């Protein structure tokens, strides 16, 4: 379904996102979500408010391009502009961060819909179908794989997220995954030009990491260049300990074990902003801390 | 309802790894009654029982330093019960010269019991061989799988552009296994060599395939040589080990023709050429122990 070229691009990007213990940032919080978030620190869920907190993020020192490989965006954000009229879309394309687009059971028209984003500054997508049976599994999976196979046609690296929202977890995770990658091998996907955002099998980070790797190394091929875990609910310190642990786990791991965090990278930064554009530096620090912290968990050198 | 208990796994894995542990490979001493004959036929021998037994006695009794290039030797039913010219048992001769013994199960029917036998006789690992076809054989190999492991043994998953095919088949095969809840870690894989070319390519395509389908839980992948001349089976395995792709698993060899061709031709039936045979075999044995470690220099 591809030409050497198309692959070269897909792989070049997939790897370039996790290249050196680098991870992925979630700047795709839905319109409501962002409000539940900004709510915790009593700021209104207004376009501006969002554009602002985010302007902060993407304006940190150009050394951030070392802990982050790419930032996924929510449609709106992906067309928002910084105080200078510059597109949040090019501010990243500069430093060296790749822009992603939260696409989300939306198979129809997600072709020319992608081809758009790709040519707007996005290079990879992100689709999600929740899991916690036989007709679902095979579906979400064959669904994923379907979705994925398109992005390839539209120079987009697809991050597959067969998440299993909250050891018994292992068995499940393994099966789901085993279906998922099988599914992909059928639609003749290009694993090498893929990525995987699996949940983190949730116990001490050691164990939590153990079970997790065993599962992945039992199912996810060595052709997938990376496995950026999502933190979904883990406190900023736990998402780091576990990713770290996962990287120290004594199992084979033919693939970059990274992070694709949102809450684990913002919680502190966002709480330090609280809407007062006067705390810009404070926010950028709580974010620089988490960004670096997890860049270490990704190379298992964190402590 | 898991097929095994922490222990049972420990054993299965301990063996699977112990077979490929240090660039060590697997020997095919399972040639069928008919097969063996065709072989013995080239050297022009009669397909007796004895004739066979001796040739083999020669191999299995080679310099105890052979246990540095071979981790396991697969066997044909009859042989597992033959005795060297000293009444001693190959079953033990090989188990003493540090080499795990394998049994050919080639037939899904009432295999369990059949295995449980072998396991307690000195065997610890075994063998066995369009969308439809694939699924059947897939789910087939999965049964042969689960059963072996119920009985301490280790299933040697042996699955049958050749890339595209190899990948699909394999992708079905390992999926199949994940369903019957097999213990990949206590498994092994004898995939053919993704081939029609330089061992550089022949190896490339091959690895890409495997690393695209075979999990990192499978401790090893002992290729079969089926047809490659003794030198090609060595170059390719070597090449495969030098290929620049991730390879979370021991890439070994599970050869027959590639280890005997020369040795057998040096024996020709004359028990008087015992040393000559044991050399042509010692050469291939070591030669491929290097390809397994991609340390094989080919003058």
Instruction: Report how far residue B240's alpha carbon sits from residue A223's, in angstroms, rounded to the nearest whole number.
Output: 16
How far is CA A152 from each of CA A50, A223, A284, A288, rounded to the nearest angstrom?
A: 31, 16, 35, 33
Instruction: Report how far residue A150's alpha carbon sits from residue A281's, in angstroms, rounded to the nearest whole number.
Output: 41
Q: In this structure, are residues B96 and B122 in contact, taking their beta carbons and an 8 Å threshold?
A: no
Q: At what angle do helices A263-273 and A236-248 cross, to 10 degrees?
A: 150
Which of B159, B141, B133 lies closest to B221 in space, CA to CA?
B159
In this structure, the number of other CB atoms found within 10 A of the CB of residue A104 comes to 15
Dig out the tokens for A18 from the structure.
């996790």
- Measure the CA angle with vertex B118, ends B112 and B124; round to 5°: 95
Q: In this structure, are residues B263 and B281 in contact, taking their beta carbons and an 8 Å threshold?
A: yes
Dig out the tokens for B150 from the structure.
């119920």
Q: In this structure, are residues B189 and B222 in contact, taking their beta carbons and an 8 Å threshold?
A: yes
Q: In this structure, are residues A62 and A95 in contact, taking their beta carbons and an 8 Å threshold?
A: yes
Q: In this structure, are residues B3 and B181 in contact, taking their beta carbons and an 8 Å threshold?
A: yes
Hey, is A274 helix, strand or coil?
coil
DSSP E strands, A189-292: 195-196, 260-261
Report the CATH number at residue A45.
3.20.20.70
* Burial status of residue B192 (CB atoms within 10 A of its CB: 0-12, 13-18, 19 or more): middle
Q: In terms of DSSP bridges, do strands B25-29 and A23-27 run parallel, antiparallel, or are they unpaired?
A: unpaired
- Stated as kind and residue range, the H or E segment containing A126 is strand A122-127
Q: In this structure, are residues A120 and A89 in contact, taking their beta carbons and an 8 Å threshold?
A: yes
- Measure the CA angle with vertex B15, ends B184 and B218; round to 5°: 25
DSSP E strands, B163-213: 188-189
Q: Phi/psi of residue A29, each to 5°? A: -50, 125
Q: How many CA atoms lie within 13 A of A102 on its CB side?
A: 20
* Burial status of residue B170 (CB atoms within 10 A of its CB: 0-12, 13-18, 19 or more): buried
Dig out the tokens for B247 from the structure.
């390879």
Nearest residue of chain B to residue A191 (CA atoms) = B212
Which DSSP symbol is given to A268? H
Which DSSP symbol is given to B1? -
Shortest Cα–Cα distance, A215 to chain B (Å): 9
Contact B248 A217 (CB under 8 A): yes
* Burial status of residue B30 (CB atoms within 10 A of its CB: 0-12, 13-18, 19 or more): buried
Dig out the tokens for B124 from the structure.
């610890």
How does A220-230 read in b/e, with b if 16+ C-beta sit within 10 Å? bbbbbbbbbbb
Q: Which domain holds residue B112?
A: 1-299
Instruction: Report how far residue B91's alpha carbon sits from residue B75's, in angstroms, rounded to the nearest whole number.
Output: 9
Instruction: Report how far residue B251's alpha carbon sits from residue B127's, in angstroms, rounded to the nearest whole number.
Output: 18
Instruction: Report how far residue B277's alpha carbon sits from residue B265's, in angstroms, rounded to the nearest whole number.
Output: 8
Residue partners of A246: CB distance under 8 A and separation at least 6: A200, A205, A209, A212, A213, A229, A257, A297, A300
- All residues of chain B having their beta carbon less than 8 Å from the beta carbon of residue A137 are none
Q: In this structure, are residues B247 and A222 in contact, taking their beta carbons and an 8 Å threshold?
A: yes
Hey, is A36 helix, strand or coil?
helix
Dig out the tokens for B201 from the structure.
């390519």
In this structure, the number of other CB atoms found within 10 A of the CB of residue B243 comes to 22
Dig out the tokens for A171 from the structure.
């068995």
Residue partners of A55: CB distance under 8 A and separation at least 6: A80, A82, A83, A88
Instruction: Report how far residue A57's alpha carbon sits from residue A88's, in angstroms, rounded to the nearest whole number.
Output: 10
Dig out the tokens for B97 from the structure.
């010269």
Torsion of CA A168, A250, B240, B224, to 10 degrees: -50
DSSP letter string, B102-158: EEE----TTHHHHHHHHHTTT--EEE---HHHHHHHHHHHHHHHHHHHHTT--BEE-
Strand partners, A99: A71, A122
If one counts the domains in chain B, the total is 1
Which of A265, A292, A17 lies closest to A9 in space, CA to CA?
A17
Hey, is A144 helix, strand or coil?
helix
Q: Which residues, numbered 121 to 180 in chain A, qualify as contacts with chain B under a Cβ-Cβ cut-off of 8 Å?
A: 174-175, 178-179
Residue partners of B39: CB distance under 8 A and separation at least 6: B31, B260, B264
Instruction: Report how far residue B12's alpha carbon sits from residue A131's, in angstroms, rounded to the nearest whole number.
Output: 32
How far is CA A135 from each of CA A189, A210, B28, B271, rounded to the nearest angstrom?
A: 22, 29, 44, 64
Shortest Cα–Cα distance, A217 to chain B (Å): 5
Dig out the tokens for A216 from the structure.
């992945």
Hey, is B225 helix, strand or coil?
coil
Instruction: Report how far residue B16's alpha carbon sits from residue B8's, in angstroms, rounded to the nearest whole number.
Output: 12
Q: In this structure, are residues B187 and B145 in contact, taking their beta carbons and an 8 Å threshold?
A: yes
> Counting runs of H as helices and runs of E as strands, what totals does chain A give?
11, 7
Hey, is B183 helix, strand or coil?
coil
Q: Phi/psi of residue B83, each to 5°? A: -125, 140
Residue partners of A39: CB distance under 8 A and separation at least 6: A45
Q: Phi/psi of residue A252, each to 5°? A: -65, 150
Instruction: Report how far residue A174's alpha carbon sits from residue A218's, in angstroms, rounded to the nearest whole number.
Output: 7
User: Does B158 participate in catalysis according to the annotation?
Assistant: yes
Instruction: Report how far residue B199's alpha carbon sits from residue B195's, in angstroms, rounded to the nearest whole number.
Output: 10
Catalytic residue among B158, B167, B230, B250: B158
Instruction: Report how far residue B274's alpha carbon sits from residue B263's, in angstroms, rounded to the nearest whole number.
Output: 9
User: Does B104 participate in catalysis according to the annotation?
Assistant: no
Q: In this structure, are residues A60 and A76 in contact, taking their beta carbons and an 8 Å threshold?
A: no
Q: In this structure, are residues A299 and A269 in contact, taking their beta carbons and an 8 Å threshold?
A: no
Q: In terms of DSSP bridges, do strands B125-127 and B156-157 run parallel, antiparallel, or are they unpaired?
A: unpaired
Radius of gyration, alpha carbons of chain B = 18
Q: In this structure, are residues B221 and B210 in contact, taking their beta carbons and an 8 Å threshold?
A: yes
> Does the annotation list A233 as a binding residue?
yes
Experimental technique behind these coordinates: X-ray
Dig out the tokens for B251 from the structure.
């890439």
- Stated as kind and residue range, the H or E segment containing A76 is none
Dig out the tokens for A224 from the structure.
């997938």
Q: Phi/psi of residue B132, each to 5°? A: -55, -65
Instruction: Report how far residue A66's alpha carbon sits from residue A153's, in angstroms, rounded to the nearest whole number.
Output: 29
- Measure the CA angle with vertex B268, ends B266 and B269; round to 5°: 130
Nearest residue of chain A to residue B185 (CA atoms) = A218
Dig out the tokens for A223 from the structure.
């052709």
- Measure the CA angle with vertex A214, ends A208 and A215; round to 5°: 90
Nearest residue of chain A to residue B219 (CA atoms) = A252
Instruction: Report how far residue B231's alpha carbon sits from residue B290's, in angstroms, rounded to the nearest whole number.
Output: 12
Q: Which residue has the tokens 């420990």?
A: B10
Which of B80, B176, B188 lies closest to B136 in space, CA to CA?
B176
Contacts within 8 Å (CB) and 24+ apart, A89-93:
A89/A120, A89/A121, A90/A121, A91/A58, A91/A59, A92/A58, A92/A121, A93/A121
In this structure, the number of other CB atoms found within 10 A of the CB of residue B57 comes to 22
Instruction: Report how far residue A4's alpha carbon sits from residue A65's, in angstroms, rounded to the nearest whole number.
Output: 28
Instruction: Report how far residue A195's alpha carbon sits from residue A14's, in angstroms, rounded to the nearest whole number.
Output: 6
Hey, is A244 helix, strand or coil?
helix
Contact A253 B248 (CB under 8 A): yes
Instruction: Report how far residue A224's alpha carbon sits from residue A143's, in angstroms, rounded to the nearest whole number.
Output: 19
Dig out the tokens for B45 from the structure.
């021998």
Instruction: Report how far residue B93's alpha carbon sits from residue A85's, in angstroms, rounded to the nearest whole number.
Output: 81
Instruction: Report how far residue A164's alpha carbon sits from residue A170's, in angstroms, rounded to the nearest whole number.
Output: 10
Shortest Cα–Cα distance, B248 to chain A (Å): 6
Three-state secondary structure readout of B45-95: CCCCHHHHHHHHHHHHCCCHHHCCCEEEEEECCCHHHCECCCCCEHHHHHH
Radius of gyration, alpha carbons of chain A = 18
DSSP E strands, A12-121: 23-27, 68-73, 98-102
Which of A214, A113, A223, A101 lies closest to A167 in space, CA to CA?
A214
Contact B212 A221 (CB under 8 A): yes
Torsion of CA B62, B65, B66, B67, to 10 degrees: 120
Q: Which residues, numbered 91 to 110 in chain A, qualify as contacts with chain B under a Cβ-Cβ cut-off of 8 Å?
A: none
Instruction: State this model's resolution in angstroms.
Output: 3.0
């Amino acid at each position: 379904a591809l030409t050497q070229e198309q692959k070269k691009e897909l792989s070049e990007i997939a790897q370039s996102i996790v290249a050196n213990g680098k991870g992925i940032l979630a700047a795709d919080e839905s319109v409501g979500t962002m409000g539940n978030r900004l709510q915790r620190i009593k700021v209104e869920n207004t376009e501006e408010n969002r554009r602002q907190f985010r302007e902060i993020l993407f304006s940190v020192d150009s050394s951030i391009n070392q802990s982050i490989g790419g930032v996924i965006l929510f449609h709106e954000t992906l067309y928002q502009k910084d105080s200078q009229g510059k597109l949040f879309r090019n501010i990243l394309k500069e430093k060296g961060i790749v822009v992603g687009i939260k696409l989300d059971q939306g198979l129809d028209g997600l072709s020319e819909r992608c081809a758009q984003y790709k040519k707007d500054g996005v290079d990879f997508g992100k689709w999600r179908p929740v899991l916690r049976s036989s007709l679902a599994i095979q579906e979400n999976a064959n669904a994923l794989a379907r979705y994925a196979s398109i992005c390839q046609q539209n120079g987009l690296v697809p991050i597959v997220e067969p998440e299993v929202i909250p050891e018994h977890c292992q068995y499940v995770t393994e099966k789901v995954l085993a279906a998922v990658y099988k599914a992909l091998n059928d639609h003749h996907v290009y694993l090498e030009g893929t990525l995987l955002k699996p949940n983190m099998v949730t116990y001490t980070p050691e164990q939590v990491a153990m079970a997790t790797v065993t599962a992945l190394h039992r199912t996810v091929p060595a052709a997938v260049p990376g496995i950026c875990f999502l933190s979904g609910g883990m406190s900023e310190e736990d998402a780091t300990l576990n990713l770290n642990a996962i990287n120290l786990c004594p199992l084979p791991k033919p693939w970059k074990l990274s992070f694709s965090y949102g809450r684990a990278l913002q919680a502190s930064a966002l709480a330090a902003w609280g809407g007062k554009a006067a705390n810009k530096e404070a926010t950028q620090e709580a974010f620089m801390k988490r960004a670096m912290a997890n860049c270490q968990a990704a190379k298992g050198q964190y402590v």
